[PDB]
Design a protein around this ligand. Structure first.
Ligand SMILES: Cc1cc2nc3c(=O)[nH]c(=O)nc-3n(C[C@H](O)[C@H](O)[C@H](O)COP(=O)(O)OP(=O)(O)OC[C@H]3O[C@@H](n4cnc5c(N)ncnc54)[C@H](O)[C@@H]3O)c2cc1C
Ligand SMILES: Cc1cc2nc3c(=O)[nH]c(=O)nc-3n(C[C@H](O)[C@H](O)[C@H](O)COP(=O)(O)OP(=O)(O)OC[C@H]3O[C@@H](n4cnc5c(N)ncnc54)[C@H](O)[C@@H]3O)c2cc1C
Ligand SMILES: [Cl-]
Ligand SMILES: [Cl-]
Lengths: 431, 431
C-alpha cells in the first residue's frame, strides 16, 4: 500500500524533494502551473552544506548541479569580499573564507532541466495551477482542484509553490496578510558589463571576484559570469513608498536611474553603473518577514521552500534553506513509509500528520530566523553610519555579526536535525 | 571523459559499490565469473549503521533491501540474547538492545536481484572470470584478462571478488599465504525446523526470538524465518584437523552427525537438532585472520569487501564492513572526479592513486580489527568453562567485552571516516 505525495510547484525545491521521495519508493506527482521552464539564465549558488543535503536526497541531484556549472596549479578557495563603496579610499574592509568548494554555482534553468531529467517520466504534470484544496477527514485523501477542471487525490500535500504560494493561502486564508509576502522597502537594479569595462572601473583584482560594496542606504554586488567575459551588477537601494499594489515585481528601468542612487559614491563604483546597458531591470524584494507563518504544516498539508519562508536574498542561501526542508520532509516520509508497512489506513494517515507535525517543530525556528537574518545583514550593509567619518568604527563592527550569521547558515548540522525529526515523529505517535 | 572503474565481482559489495558510483556519473563495469544464478536463498542482516551507509551510497539500495524482506501494535526493538545451552537451566544470560530497526533483514538472493534491477543496463558482465591483471605506467589504463580469452581496459580496478579473491593474489603473489584465506578450525551445520517443532522444543518465547546458546567448544544460534513459520539453526563446532586441500567449503552432512557434537548439551537443544531434516549442510569457516592483507590498495588497484578482509561470521556484520568500504571508495572516487575534471591525464591518474592510498590509510585498521574480533567473540561463546558450574562467574564475565565489541561495530562514525579520507586524499596530492 504505497504512499502518494502531491507536490504543488515544480521549482528547484519541489523537484529536489520529488527526487528524494521517488528514489525511496514513494509515489509522487509534481503539479506545475507553467508549461515549461523559467528563470532562464541566472546564476545561483549553493553552500557546501546544501550540496551534502542534496547528496543525501539522491546523489544524482549533485551530478545534475555539476553538469550545469563551470589548468593545473592548486584548487581554488571561495571568498566573500566586502569593499568600501562610499568613500574614495575604496578600501577592502573584510573577507570570509568558505573553503574549497565552499560554494558551488550553476545556471538555474539548466540545473532545473537537469533535475527534471533525473526524475522518472510522468512525475511532473505541467499546466496544473492549483486553485483549491479540499480537506476531508484524516483517514481520507486530500483533493487538489486545478484551474483546468481536473482534480487529483493524494494521501498528503506539500506546498512548494513559491513566495506567492496557493497552499499557504489555503492554510491561513486568502484574506490573511500571513498568506502573502510583503515589500521589504528595497529594490534592485541588475545589468551586465563587459569584463574589459569592469577592469577599467575597478582594477583587475576586484573585477574577477565577488565583492559587495557597502555604503549608506544602498549596496552593490558584482561577480564574473560567462567564463569571466562579463560581470553581473546587482545594486540595492532603499524605497520609502509602498510598492504599488497589483504592480509587477519586475519592470524596466534605465542605467541613469541606477546612477542617481549612487551619485555620492566613489568613482570606480559609479563608472561600473555607467558601463551598463541603457535599459536594465528593477526587481522589488518581497519576503515573509512582516507576517511569518504561525506553522509550516497542519494535518496532511506541509509548506516547504519559499512557500514556507521566502527571504530577501542578502545571504544568497534561500534555496539552501529549502534544500534542508526537502531533506527533512523526505526522511520523515520514508520513516512514515517503513514504520507503517502493513498497518491500517487509520494508522498510516495519523503517521503522516505526526511527521508533518515534527517537520514544523524542527524547521520553523531556523527557517524564520533566516528570514530575519536576511533583512538584518542587508541593514548592516546599508548602515547610514558608513557615510559618517566619525562612525566608521562602530559601523565596521558589524562584520563579526556577518561572520557568525554566515557561519550559522553554512555549518548547519543537518544530521542532528534528522535525528531530532525522527524522535519527534516517534514521540508524536505515542511511541 | 569520465573516470572508468572495473569492479571484479558482482557480489553484494561489488553491486552496492557500482550503484554508488554510477549514481555519481562514473562509468562502471562489473565483471562476475558466475553465470547469473547469483546468491543463495539464505538470509542476512544489516545494522542500522550499514543501512545509513547504503542510503548515502544511493537511496534505492535501501529501497531494494526493505522490499526484499518480509513485512513485520507498538514498534519492535531488535534484541540479541544469550542463553546457557549446556545445562537444562537454560538460563537467559545476556541481552543487547539494538533499537528500532537496529538490524534490517533480507533474503540475500532477493536483494542482489533488486539491486541489479536498480543498476543501469549494461553494467554487470556475467561469465567474466578474471585471470590476470596487466598494469603499466600510472597514466595508462589497467588491463583485465578474463578466462574466456577476452580483455577489458579500465582507468582503475577494484577487487570485489570475495574470500577467494583473484585481485588479492595478483597483489601479493599466487604462492604467498597472504593471497589465500585459511581455516578457522570451526565449521557449521545448518538446517531448518518448523515453528511447531521449535516451540515444542524450546518454548514459545525462545522459539520466536533470536537466541545464541553458548557452551563448551561449540555454540548454536537460531531465529525465525519465512514469516515466523520456521526457524533456522546454525550450529558451530570445533575441528582440530586441517581442512583438506581444495576440498569444497560446503558439503552434505546428517542431523545425526550434528547431534553427536551436542550429546551432552541440554535437552531442548538436542531436540532442535533432532527436528532438522535428515540431510543438512556443513559449512567450513575460513577468513583472513592468520594472514591479513599488508595493504588494501596499491597503485590503481584496491580491494574491498571479503576480498580485503573476509571474516568468520560471529558478529553477523562482515558485509556491513564491506558497505563502509563501498561508501569510502565511492566518496573518494567522486572527489577524484570533480577535483581533476579539466586536468591532464597525469593529474587524474595520480589522483586515483592518491585516493586508493587514502582508502588504505583509513580502512585497514578497522577492518582487520573486525576480523580478529569475529574470532574472539566466538572463543567467548565457546569457552570450555561454560561446562563447569563452579567457573560460572568467569564465563559470564565475557559479556562486557562482547558489548564493547558489538558497540564498536554498530556505532561506526562513517562521517568522520569520510572527512578523514578526504583530508588524506588532499594531503596525498601535495596540498
Ligand atoms: C535575486 C535572488 C538571488 C538568489 N540567489 C540564491 C543563491 O545563490 N543560492 C540559494 O540557495 N538561493 C538563492 N535565492 C533564493 C532562491 O532562489 C529561492 O529560495 C528558490 O527559488 C525557492 O525555491 P522554490 O521551489 O520554493 O520556489 P520557486 O522557485 O518560486 O518555485 C515555485 C514553483 O511553484 C509554481 N507555482 C506557483 N504557484 C503555483 C500554483 N498555484 N500551482 C502550481 N504551481 C505553482 C511556480 O511556477 C514555480 O514553478 C535567490 C533569490 C533571489 C530573489
Ligand atoms: C554464514 C554466514 C552468514 C553471514 N551473515 C551476515 C549478516 O548477517 N550480515 C552481514 O553484514 N554479513 C554477513 N556475512 C558476511 C557477508 O556474507 C560477507 O561479508 C559478504 O558476503 C561479502 O560480500 P562480497 O561482495 O565481498 O563477496 P562475495 O559475496 O563472495 O562476492 C564475490 C563475487 O566475486 C565473484 N568472483 C570471485 N572470483 C571472481 C573472479 N576471478 N572473477 C570474477 N568474479 C569473481 C564471485 O563469483 C562472487 O560473486 C555472513 C557470512 C557467512 C558465511
Ligand atoms: Cl537568497
Ligand atoms: Cl559476518
Amino acid at each position: 500500500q504505497p504512499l502518494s505525495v502531491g507536490i504543488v510547484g515544480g521549482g528547484i525545491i519541489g523537484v529536489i524533494l520529488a527526487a528524494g521521495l521517488v528514489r525511496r519508493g514513494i509515489d509522487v506527482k509534481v503539479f506545475e502551473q507553467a508549461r515549461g521552464f523559467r528563470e532562464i539564465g541566472a546564476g545561483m549558488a549553493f553552500t557546501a552544506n546544501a550540496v551534502r543535503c542534496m547528496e543525501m536526497l539522491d546523489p544524482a541531484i549533485v551530478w545534475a548541479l555539476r553538469s550545469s556549472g563551470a589548468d593545473h596549479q592548486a584548487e581554488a578557495r571561495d571568498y566573500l569580499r566586502w569593499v568600501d563603496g562610499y568613500h574614495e579610499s575604496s578600501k577592502r574592509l573584510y573577507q570570509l573564507d568558505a573553503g574549497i568548494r565552499g560554494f558551488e554555482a550553476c545556471r538555474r534553468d539548466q540545473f532545473l532541466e537537469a533535475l527534471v531529467k533525473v526524475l522518472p517520466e510522468g512525475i511532473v504534470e505541467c499546466q496544473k495551477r492549483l486553485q483549491k484544496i479540499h480537506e476531508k477527514n484524516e483517514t481520507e485523501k486530500v483533493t487538489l482542484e486545478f484551474a483546468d477542471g481536473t482534480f487529483a487525490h493524494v494521501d498528503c500535500v506539500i506546498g512548494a509553490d513559491g513566495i506567492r504560494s496557493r497552499v499557504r493561502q489555503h492554510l491561513f486564508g486568502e484574506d490573511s496578510p500571513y498568506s502573502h509576502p510583503h515589500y521589504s522597502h528595497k529594490f534592485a537594479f541588475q545589468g551586465l558589463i563587459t569584463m574589459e569595462n569592469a577592469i577599467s572601473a575597478l582594477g583587475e583584482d576586484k573585477a574577477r571576484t565577488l565583492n559587495m560594496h557597502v555604503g549608506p542606504n544602498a549596496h552593490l554586488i558584482h561577480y564574473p559570469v560567462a567564463n569571466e567575459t562579463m560581470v553581473n551588477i546587482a545594486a540595492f537601494v532603499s524605497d520609502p513608498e509602498e510598492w504599488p499594489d497589483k504592480l509587477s515585481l519586475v519592470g524596466p528601468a534605465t542605467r541613469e536611474e541606477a546612477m542617481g542612487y549612487f551619485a555620492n559614491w566613489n568613482p570606480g563604483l559609479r563608472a561600473v553603473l555607467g558601463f551598463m546597458p541603457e535599459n536594465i531591470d528593477r526587481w522589488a524584494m518581497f519576503d515573509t518577514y512582516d507576517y511569518p507563518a504561525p506553522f509550516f504544516s497542519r494535518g496532511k498539508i506541509c509548506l516547504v521552500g519559499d512557500a514556507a519562508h521566502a527571504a530577501v536574498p542578502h545571504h544568497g542561501a534561500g534555496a539552501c534553506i529549502g534544500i534542508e526542508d526537502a531533506l527533512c520532509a523526505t526522511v520523515l516520509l520514508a520513516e512514515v513509509f517503513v514504520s507503517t508497512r502493513g498497518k491500517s489506513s487509520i494508522v498510516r494517515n495519523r503517521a503522516i500528520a505526526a511527521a508533518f507535525g515534527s517537520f514544523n517543530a524542527v524547521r520553523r525556528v531556523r527557517a524564520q530566523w533566516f528570514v530575519d537574518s536576511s533583512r538584518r545583514v542587508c541593514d548592516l550593509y546599508q548602515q547610514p553610519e558608513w557615510a559618517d567619518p566619525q562612525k566608521r568604527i562602530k559601523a565596521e563592527n558589524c562584520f563579526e555579526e556577518i561572520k557568525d550569521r554566515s557561519h550559522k547558515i553554512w555549518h548547519f548540522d543537518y544530521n542532528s536535525m534528522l535525528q531530532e525529526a525522527i524522535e519527534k515523529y516517534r514521540h508524536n505517535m505515542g511511541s
